[PDB]
Design a protein around this nucleic acid. Structure first.
Lengths: 187, 493, 526
DNA sequence: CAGCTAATGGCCATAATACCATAATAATAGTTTTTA
DNA sequence: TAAAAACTATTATTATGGTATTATGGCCTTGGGC
């Protein structure tokens, strides 16, 4: 929680940017840490959340996929119910979600797959409380739903390459149990 | 980068002998010369490496496996019992024992010796630049017998100079200090003078220190629209020692002590997180981040700005404080400030005007207002440089500078005094110099370390005058200070 | 110091004048006066303040009647400062507008000195009436208050929005406002204060007439109450011939912090948890802990470890004694160079006087130096605790009073020198002059000091001096902000800051088209 | 006693220390190239 | 598709400083009716 803290700091006042080697580690083994957490709540969502959100430009690009390697496993291994988090921030987030998606996805690189991974994944967690929620997922369901849905039909007229896989899962993630509260019948 | 410097003694035969002269073998004089530079680089503490080798002799020390040689040591920054290890070699007991125990003199062959010591330039594994060697000889005749050896002198010689490798012969007293001019060129290899002896070497390097250094390179934006990058330079730092180093007691070895923070209440630890950087007064403790502090510096960035132009004479000393060290504006990288900076200094000096800047030290700082006098460019025939072209990095005066200084009345003197006072000072004046100026009282300790270096009784205990000499004070001027004393007062001091 | 401080302040209507550019005069008043607040937190001494409020809407004071005392409020009482006294700035302050008269707050300020300093021992005192001089001005009791505050040993100040004679800075670079912006009501008040000041400390006080904005340009209040440099006892030896008891004095020298940024705890702030780790180790091969910190004191140098102790240090060390100052000789100034004036700490050196004779003969040798451009070569061993040193020292001459200043003679090692190819060789760089001359004319337009006043005092824009340096100022803004308000990001940089930071744009404007000829005539590479 | 000591109250310079922060060089990796 | 070098760039190196900081540094200030 120190390392958490002083990197939370180093992200701030030095050229607005941390030392990404140092986040790569913090998050890196923070993998295992989270694996052991049992439901982080307060800071940590923002911790992660931030780190990825700041991974999103040319910053101090080092082995530039390293820049991308930071989130690579970073979101990935973070499957927790603590990693069920931006379900707090989602309708906001999913914006950011696809922003990173488009980001590295379209960023011409040798690790796309990570994107795809967490994409599907936090995508899933979404889908999961969605599966558990009519209240916060009926509309806000259809919020995130349509968020991606622009991509759903986006595939029809465009060339997404491997991103096709993407849709299907979201093309699933739309219809999960969902025809109950939101009819996927035509789906 | 950290270079080569080389001791060598010639040998034909009689050299290690005294020429039967009743003072010393000039061989030995050389011995203390070796002592003097190798020791010298204790003081100067030079990452230059030093060489000790002889040749022309009975037995050998070498890896080249030929007659009439000895290595002494391979290239080194010095060592204490490298010093001691060589310290056996003074004294007639040590003359001889050194000689015979190693064997002393048979024959030699010259350029063979060249690539000998040269092939100590083989010894380089590291970054050196200066190839500088010294032969110790009175030899008038290398040989008459085989002039193929002479052609070998004039032959490999040019190679080794062409090798950039340079040995000369200082004037070491063969009689007349030498009587030979004649064939001698081959034997040997910013306005100054030269000398024939070691004494200059001795004292000159008694306090001496680092030479090749230029490191951290800043910039100056002139306006927002135009460029210079600025070389930071230390004419000196007010040079100090490499400071006391941690070595534990009987173990003698570096402590490799470390430091962090345990919790000072509970037996736990502490972390920079766990703490912060505070100011406290009165009731209120106030705590703000080591970051918050270090970026509260922030205004622009390390770099510099022409802030204007001022009369040079505007400020002489109403004032003074922490020096300019000397920034030379870089012109290779950014040139045209070759021209720009050139005529800048030309005419701003002509204007008696200067370029003010706000200097922003390294990894930021709060920056500060500091004038830059244009520094003129002074070179003579051989180009003594007192004023490397540049800027005086002129701190501006500020509140703290003036934070306090008293003012009250002053009662004033009369010309009756000055009539004498002037010439009195003419007796008290000296033309001074650039040189022989220091705070040796710190030097005296790397004397005190010269001790363990040689492991001997009392230091060099050398002489600079940082203290006035009474015979001259009471000599040239005299007691006319009496006249002054009773001029207006019966002091009783 | 140890003192009482009377801030006599106008918040009223004309202090509330809506004004372009620089802030309104009462806004100015809490800006400068609260920099007084700053510097009180930055004084950290015995200084007190009891407050005379005018321009306010109300009256608080020993008598409320008299036809005076009108709009005279007593907020504060002379006390060793405290942070609540900081907070009253953050609390009470407003654009309170209603009128007192001037002799009213002048005699109230008198009492502020009177009865509180009674019972509070203060060697120096001051009363400072900061007002734009809008009222019906009482000339009645003027000289009474004036020489009675002489009895109260009151040095005196006044702030207002103007001078007696590319923005207009609220601080830095002299009077800034359209020069005639004075409302002439405030010029009759100007005459009033003229009388008061010419009466107490003399007519010189008409320069001691100040504004609030120049109060942000200068240090002005800084030099009032405070101790002079303290005698440094020893003898300057002039030859084995002459030795003299003298007073060395520290003249120009570098500031530093008031504390390290106390590194102590977070989440508590309690230093109890706080200390660093000794952690002395063995050297190699698991190199484990070592205890009983003591070690030999040694080095490597060269290739050689330098085993040694602190003992052999202490003993084997030659030194000075406890002190000394001895002329080492003299020289002309011709061969001599400013760069080759080195040091940081500088000593104005005045007499051990009373028996001042050798200070007079000192003057003799001084003008023996100045005629002939003669410089002093002197050992100096600082007195109070055990140190040798040696350095240059030189007389500075400013007609009214002069001293010799001890400074470091740059020492023979002190010259680094390179292989640098001469700029005397431009043979690879020359343009047409035709640009060079023009940008010279720029160098004039950018000449910071040009001849002013026809005193031949070229007023250097950036005239050094009362214009400070950030580190402290910067912090100070951090200090009022965070000290007086919760944690935040970067605090106000208020451009009076950058006013100071940046020269005036008449010069700069005069650079603009020359700033053009730079880019045009002078290209770039890379 | 004589005058109160005299180490009390205070503490500035230092040197030391630290952080802390770069070129003098020397590496990494690096993203392109087709090839397969 | 990778897959090859690839001369490029990077960020890596300290030695050397400078800050900045520590520390008291051996001194000037405090005391009481006999």
């Amino acid at each position: 929680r120190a390392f958490l803290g002083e990197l939370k700091t180093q992200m701030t006042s030095a050229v607005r940017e941390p030392k990404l080697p140092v986040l790569a580690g913090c998050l890196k083994g923070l993998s295992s840490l989270l694996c052991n957490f049992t439901k982080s709540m307060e800071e940590d969502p923002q911790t992660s959340r931030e780190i990825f959100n700041f991974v999103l430009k040319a910053i101090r690009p080092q082995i530039d996929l390293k820049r991308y390697a930071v989130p690579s496993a970073g979101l990935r291994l973070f499957a927790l119910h603590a990693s069920q988090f931006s379900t707090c921030l989602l309708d906001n987030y999913v914006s950011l979600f696809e922003v990173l998606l488009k980001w590295c996805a379209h960023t011409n690189v040798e690790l796309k797959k990570a994107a795809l991974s967490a994409l599907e994944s936090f995508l899933k967690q979404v889908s999961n409380m969605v599966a558990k929620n009519a209240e916060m997922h009926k509309n806000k369901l259809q919020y995130f739903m349509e968020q991606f849905y622009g991509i759903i039909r986006n595939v029809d007229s465009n060339n997404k390459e491997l991103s096709i896989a993407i849709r299907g899962y979201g093309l699933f993630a739309g219809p999960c149990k969902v025809i109950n509260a939101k009819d996927v019948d035509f789906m | 980068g950290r270079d080569s410097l080389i001791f060598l003694v010639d040998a034909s035969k009689a050299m290690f002998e005294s020429q039967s002269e009743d003072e010393l073998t000039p061989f030995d004089m050389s011995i203390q010369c070796i002592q003097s530079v190798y020791i010298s680089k204790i003081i100067s503490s030079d990452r230059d490496l030093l060489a000790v080798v002889f040749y022309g002799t009975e037995k050998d020390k070498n890896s080249v496996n030929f007659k009439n040689i000895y290595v002494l040591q391979e290239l080194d920054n010095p060592g204490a019992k490298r010093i001691l290890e060589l310290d056996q070699f003074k004294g007639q007991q040590g003359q001889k024992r050194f000689q015979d125990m190693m064997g002393h003199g048979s024959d030699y062959s010259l350029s063979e010796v060249l690539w000998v010591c040269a092939n100590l330039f083989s010894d380089v594994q590291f970054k050196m630049s200066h190839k500088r060697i010294m032969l110790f000889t009175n030899e008038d005749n290398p040989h008459g017998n085989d002039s193929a050896k002479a052609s070998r002198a004039r032959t490999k010689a040019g190679d080794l100079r062409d090798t950039g490798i340079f040995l000369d012969l200082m004037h070491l007293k063969k009689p007349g200090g030498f009587d030979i001019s004649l064939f001698y060129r081959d034997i040997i290899s910013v306005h100054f003078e030269e000398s024939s002896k070691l004494e200059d070497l001795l004292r000159k390097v008694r306090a001496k220190e680092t030479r090749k250094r230029a490191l951290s390179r800043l910039k100056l934006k002139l306006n927002k629209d135009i460029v210079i990058s600025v070389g930071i330079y230390n004419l000196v730092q007010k040079a100090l020692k490499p400071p006391p180093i941690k070595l534990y007691r009987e173990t003698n070895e570096p402590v490799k002590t470390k430091t962090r923070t345990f919790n000072t209440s509970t037996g736990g630890l502490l972390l920079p997180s766990d703490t912060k950087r505070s100011q406290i007064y009165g009731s209120r403790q106030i705590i703000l981040e080591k970051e918050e502090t270090e970026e509260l510096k922030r205004f622009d960035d390390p770099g510099l700005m022409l802030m204007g132009f001022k009369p040079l004479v505007l400020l002489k000393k109403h004032h003074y404080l922490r020096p300019s060290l000397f920034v030379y504006p870089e012109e290779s990288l950014v040139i045209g400030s070759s021209t720009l900076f050139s005529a800048l200094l030309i005419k701003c000096l002509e204007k008696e005007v200067a370029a003010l800047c706000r200097y922003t030290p390294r990894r930021n700082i709060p920056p500060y207002f500091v004038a830059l006098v244009p520094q003129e460019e002074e070179l003579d025939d051989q180009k003594i440089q007192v004023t490397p072209p540049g800027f005086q990095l002129v701190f501006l005066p500020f509140a703290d500078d003036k934070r306090k200084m008293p003012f009250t009345e002053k009662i004033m003197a009369t010309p009756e005094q000055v009539g004498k006072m002037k010439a009195i000072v003419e007796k008290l004046r000296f033309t001074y110099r650039s040189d022989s100026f220091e705070n040796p009282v710190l030097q005296q300790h790397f004397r005190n370390l010269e001790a363990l270096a040689l492991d001997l009784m009392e230091p060099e205990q050398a002489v600079d005058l940082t203290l006035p000499k009474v015979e001259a004070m009471n000599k040239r001027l005299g007691s006319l200070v009496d006249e002054f004393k009773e001029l207006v007062y019966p002091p009783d001091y | 110091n140890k003192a009482a401080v009377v801030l006599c302040m106008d918040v009223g209507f004309t202090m509330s004048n809506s004004i372009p550019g620089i802030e309104s005069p009462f806004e100015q008043a809490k800006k400068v006066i609260t920099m007084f607040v700053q510097r009180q937190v930055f004084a950290e001494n015995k200084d007190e303040i009891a407050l005379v409020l005018f321009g306010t809407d109300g009256t608080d004071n020993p008598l409320s009647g008299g036809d005076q005392y009108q709009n005279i409020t007593v907020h504060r009482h002379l006390m060793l400062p405290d942070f609540d006294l900081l907070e009253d700035i953050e609390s009470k302050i407003q654009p309170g507008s209603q009128q007192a008269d001037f002799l009213d707050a002048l005699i109230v300020s008198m009492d502020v000195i009177q009865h509180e300093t009674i019972g509070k021992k203060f060697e120096k005192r001051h009363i400072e009436i900061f007002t734009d001089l809008s009222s019906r001005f009482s000339k009645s009791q003027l000289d009474i208050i004036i020489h009675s505050l002489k009895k109260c040993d009151i040095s005196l100040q006044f702030f207002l929005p103007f001078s007696l004679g590319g923005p207009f800075r609220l601080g830095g670079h002299g009077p800034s406002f359209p020069l005639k912006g004075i409302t002439e009501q405030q010029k009759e008040g100007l005459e009033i204060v003229k009388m008061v000041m010419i009466s107490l400390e003399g007519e010189d006080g008409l320069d001691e007439i100040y504004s609030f904005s120049e109060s942000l340009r200068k240090l002005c209040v800084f030099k009032k109450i405070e101790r002079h440099s303290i005698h440094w006892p020893c003898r300057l030896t002039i030859g084995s011939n002459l030795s003299i008891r003298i007073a060395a004095y520290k003249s120009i020298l570098q500031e530093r912090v008031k504390k390290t940024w106390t590194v102590v705890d977070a989440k508590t702030l309690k230093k109890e948890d706080i200390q660093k780790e000794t952690v002395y180790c063995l050297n190699d091969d698991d190199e484990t802990e070592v205890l009983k910190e003591d070690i030999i004191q040694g080095f490597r140098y060269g290739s050689d470890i330098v085993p040694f102790s602190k003992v052999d240090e202490e003993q084997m060390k030659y030194k000075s004694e406890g002190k000394c100052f001895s002329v080492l000789g003299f020289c002309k100034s011709s061969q001599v160079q400013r760069r080759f004036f080195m040091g940081n700490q500088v000593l104005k050196v005045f007499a051990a006087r009373d028996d001042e004779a050798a200070a007079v003969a000192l003057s003799s040798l001084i003008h023996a130096l100045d005629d002939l451009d003669m410089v002093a070569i002197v050992r100096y061993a600082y007195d109070k605790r055990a140190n040798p040193q040696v350095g240059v020292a030189f007389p500075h001459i400013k007609h009214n009073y002069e001293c010799l200043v001890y400074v470091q003679l740059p020492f023979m090692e002190d010259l680094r020198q390179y292989m640098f190819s001469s700029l005397k060789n431009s043979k690879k760089y020359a343009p047409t002059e035709a640009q060079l001359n023009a940008v010279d004319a720029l160098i004039d337009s950018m000449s910071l000091a040009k001849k002013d006043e026809k005193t031949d005092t070229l007023e250097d824009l950036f005239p050094t001096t009362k214009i400070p340096n950030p580190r402290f100022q910067r912090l100070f803004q951090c200090l009022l902000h965070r000290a007086l308000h919760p944690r935040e990001p970067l605090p106000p940089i208020q451009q009076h800051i950058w006013n100071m930071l940046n020269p005036p744009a008449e010069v700069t404007t005069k650079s603009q088209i020359p700033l053009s000829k730079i880019k045009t005539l002078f290209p770039l590479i890379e």
